[PDB]
Design a protein around this ligand. Structure first.
Ligand code: MTV
Ligand code: MTV
Lengths: 453, 453
């Protein structure tokens, strides 16, 4: 009735991982390494992400590890303990077995996305402090677990409390990875924030937080803390190093030099990222794909996602550099779950039907004549949400190069009787229109995306 | 400790109103008529809106009446009845006196804004179906009343219910003005949706819904139904004519001719406006203001507002056509109320302190050297919210020309030793850079805002 998937979890640790601190972690070879062999930060290839459909296989899900994966022995897992302390009436410590036994379990489709997705495009303009991501720093899954809200609810947060700090078990360079989320979001059924212990029917792979993680829909991955150990109800935001010095969109005029040499650019919550911005990405045609000109339709296609559970109302494609726009047909598989009423899946209640929010990505398609693309220099795509907030033409360059959501552009190159298509960049190799434009010497932030007229 | 204001309510009915169906309505002469003498749709002049500060005087508050104001005798007011029916357990009818006596009362600062604000700018490009608004289709007030949520709560909405229809007592051309809002927004303390019977300490003026109206913060005025009579809890959106055929941002490529000749462009909720988009507006320098060049700072200034209670994180000004940007200093008087804890005002609880949302506009300032403006063709301004959603460069032209939130541009005209400044348009007269550009024959949607280089 709606998408469901569980695959075989991988066994083979790859030679590259055998040589590394994560020597016990079986990882899909198709994932594209972005900080070398370790720590593991990866995205699937864009075509495999799209071709997988609404649900990304666990093994192709993107990984973002700031440091090494903490070793977790399966024969002890159920006793994995999490601490609920802070501005509560009744602090307590709960183990996973007791999470499972005492709280209502749900299973829920959730798009995850990294703050960094589409970062390389920023890097091509001006190299910042972050490693390249392509456009596939997103993956969608079914997550099974309880509601953070219920766990936190049980300790009786005080009236002055505003934030739930989360802290993991891992040990990145600057210590335990930790950040926070707002308390009332935890309490809001529409946001549906979980403590998850399964993903696409399987107990968590180590890269995805085994045994236990927070998953915060409509919010950057950065706030979905893996290998969860502490939850601290508080009146103010986290003071973890990783809350301050990562996952912020600093004002465009702030330079890497200014941010290195002034701590307090990082100490204003106004630049701290929670809810994602609206992104739309073109997947068909693919990077470097060639197609013979004819009188036929080609189905341009992609996906889009948004923040705060706000639905994307329209996706629009221009072949004339944004002078005119064509309305794409959007598909929202989350509505399949919504339409379907209550189900039990992987031992959890499927209750999207209780909500109106869009916690997941969606897919769009638009057929145009190959002959219309023949007369075009590019495909552009943008989305607008139900707040009538649209993606910008202009790039918002920022130090961490996060949340880069300016219109995604695929260049159309005429070659005799065919067309070749270039995406902006490939995640870990050259091969995009941006690579070309750098060789030509174009200013990518000019009004023609750095190209010649 | 925070802004408070109550003024004398006006008595004098103006000659123009004496001649009209609204012959009993005392109206401020400084307001600018936008559909002639009647129905009354007006905005204050931009400088008076800004100069009034955080709280707009009631008399200068903007009015949007689709038709005539229903006559309400003060000596009966308390018995004004409202009907709570629909998918509830216990339908009931409550009169105002009993609203006041039985529900908790609150007093709350709320920015209102019309869907149509900044519409003329769209009209200058291509004339649509809506009457010109300038940039002052917004006003901020203290509103006193109960929570829609509590009223609706008392009837016990059913589990399948998703929407609260609202219907007024007035009789526009197509009958009772009605629309809706989502039920869970009604239940959400952060949204803080009221049934208000006072405004800046005074019982409601007739233009603002006397005796009773809904006020929905962070949402377009259109959903804040005046002269309230029915509330209908329902599983699906309103079917009022005014819900369908007003207050929608139809896809840009949809023409007035296509929308006239196809009903169903208006029957997709995805284009129905609720939460406002992010707007920033420049108020200083004013329209046509002249200033002598010197080595002095000038304080560029304005306001901004956003939807869904999402704070505006940054306001940025460019003097170089958006190549570089300067960070403005934002002031948020709503935080004054937040910081201040619990108070009683006009018989209502001031409890912004309970919330983290921004339901109100904010003010920004930026000092630049007059000599830097001297070398510029324009001031541009944009904002970005805490969802890292920024206003667009590009205009989103649409049939009703609503929610036009592309960067607001003030042209700088060099005249010997002074500078003259032109805002895009004046609400009800010529006098802007857009008027000039139309006389020159410029394409306002081109990359130089229709101007010559
Ligand atoms: N404990 C912990 N350590 C991390 O380094 C860590 N990184 C995260 C980021 S930062 Mo980003 O907004 O820079 S995307 C993202 C993800 C991704 O989870 P995945 O690896 O399961 O896809 O989990 C977040 N949770 C974390 N939790
Ligand atoms: N009963 C009723 N009739 C209206 O014509 C009507 N118009 C509204 C609109 S449509 Mo717009 O998004 O086209 S701004 C706006 C306002 C403005 O209220 P004000 O006149 O008190 O400022 O109230 C809304 N509520 C209404 N209520």
């Amino acid at each position: 009735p709606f998408p469901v998937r569980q695959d075989s979890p991988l066994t083979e640790v790859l030679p590259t991982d055998l040589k590394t601190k994560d020597n016990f972690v079986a990882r899909d070879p198709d994932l594209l390494r972005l900080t070398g062999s370790h720590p593991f930060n990866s995205e699937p290839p864009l075509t495999k992400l799209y071709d997988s459909g609404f649900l990304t296989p666990v093994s192709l899900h993107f990984v973002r590890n700031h440091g090494p994966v903490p070793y977790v022995p399966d024969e002890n897992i159920l006793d994995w303990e999490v601490s609920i302390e802070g501005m509560v009436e009744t602090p307590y410590k709960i183990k996973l077995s007791d999470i499972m036994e005492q709280f209502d379990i749900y299973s829920t489709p959730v798009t995850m996305v990294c703050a960094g997705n589409r970062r390389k495009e920023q890097n091509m303009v001006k190299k910042g402090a972050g490693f390249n991501w392509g456009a596939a720093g997103t993956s969608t899954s079914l997550w099974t677990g309880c509601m953070l809200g219920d766990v936190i609810g049980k300790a009786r947060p005080s009236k002055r409390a505003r934030f739930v700090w989360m802290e993991g078990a891992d040990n990145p360079a600057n210590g335990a990875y930790g950040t926070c989320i707002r308390l009332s979001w935890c309490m809001d059924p529409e946001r549906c924030i979980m403590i998850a212990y399964q993903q696409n029917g399987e107990w968590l792979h180590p890269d995805h937080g085994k045994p236990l993680r927070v998953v915060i829909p409509g919010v950057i991955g950065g706030r979905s803390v893996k290998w969860l150990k502490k939850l601290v109800v508080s009146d103010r935001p986290s003071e973890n190093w990783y809350h301050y010095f990562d996952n912020r969109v600093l004002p465009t005029m702030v330079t890497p030099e200014m941010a290195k040499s002034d701590d307090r650019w990082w100490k204003d919550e106004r630049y701290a990222i929670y809810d994602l911005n609206l992104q739309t990405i073109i997947c068909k045609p693919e990077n470097q794909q060639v197609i013979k000109i004819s009188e036929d339709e080609y189905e341009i296609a992609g996906f889009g996602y948004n923040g705060g559970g706000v639905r994307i109302g329209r996706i629009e494609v221009s072949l004339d550099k944004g002078k005119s726009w064509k309305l794409a047909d959007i598909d929202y598989p989350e509505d399949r779950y919504r339409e379907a009423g209550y189900f039990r899946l992987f031992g959890g209640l499927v209750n999207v039907c209780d909500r109106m929010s869009c916690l997941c990505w969606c897919f769009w398609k638009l057929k145009v004549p190959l002959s219309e693309l023949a007369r075009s220099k590019d495909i552009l795509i943008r989305g607008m949400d139900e707040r009538m907030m649209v993606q910008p033409r202009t790039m918002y360059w920022n130090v961490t190069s996060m949340l880069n959501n300016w219109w995604y552009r695929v260049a159309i190159i005429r070659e005799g009787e065919s067309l070749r298509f270039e995406h902006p960049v490939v995640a870990n190799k050259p091969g995009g229109w941006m690579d070309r434009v750098k060789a030509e010497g174009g200013d990518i932030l000019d009004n023609n995306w750095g190209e010649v007229d």
